Amino acid sequence: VLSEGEWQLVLHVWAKVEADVAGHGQDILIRLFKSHPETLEKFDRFKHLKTEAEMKASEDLKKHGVTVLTALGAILKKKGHHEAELKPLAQSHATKHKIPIKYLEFISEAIIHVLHSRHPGDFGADAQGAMNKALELFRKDIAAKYKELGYQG
Ligand code: HEM
């Protein structure tokens, strides 16, 4: 369970992310797709993007980065009472999108990298530790849903 002080560190940096949801989303998806190319294969609509410049130019990719960060932000602001928000997400990503838990670890690592690039003064070690704990809780709760449905990752 994160303490209240850890949730404050998380939501203090996220309020910065929300100043520019679309640029943050771009940087995070592009990092994910470059570091782990297999994840790009899950998206029929982005499969055609071959270079980082093509990814940066894609309005559809930018739009989907806003979708992802908007849903994550809604979960974070629930501070670990996020059952209603998480359940629809785990069901679609297990049974429709077929995303293994491992890929949620990958995108977590991209999120933490981008936050540290863009917000050094609000993302020192103590915030980085709280954010890693929040994303682990996110993954742990999804993985429980996966297990129930027969997908565990
Ligand atoms: C922070 C983690 C993630 C969040 C909050 C998230 C959220 C979302 C949301 C809100 C949607 C649209 C509604 C829905 O289909 O349920 C979506 C769709 C999708 N997500 Fe995720 N997602 C995350 C991670 C991933 C990852 C790691 C992958 C793939 C490697 C993935 C693949 C997909 C696909 C294939 C779709 C449908 C996209 C389309 O063709 O319209 N998601 N995700």
Give the Å distances, CA to CA, from 86 to 33, 54, 58, 151.
23, 32, 28, 16
Q: Are 39 and 103 in contact (CB under 8 A)?
A: yes
List of domains in the chain: 1-153 (1.10.490.10)
Annotated binding site: 64, 93
Number of neighbouring beta carbons within 10 Å of residue 52 = 12
Please report how many Cα atoms fall inside a 13 Å half-sphere around the Cα of residue 44, on the Cβ side. 2
Instruction: Tell which one of 70, 89, 103 to mutate to probe ligand 1, the residue whose CB is within 8 A of the most ligand atoms.
Output: 89
Strand spans (E) along 20-99 = none
Q: How far is the CA of 99 from the centre of ligand 1 (A)?
A: 8
Resolution in A: 1.7
Experimentally determined by: X-ray
Question: Whole-angstrom distance between the N-terminal and C-terminal Cα of the chain?
Answer: 22
The rounded Å distance from CA 98 to ligand 1 centre is 10
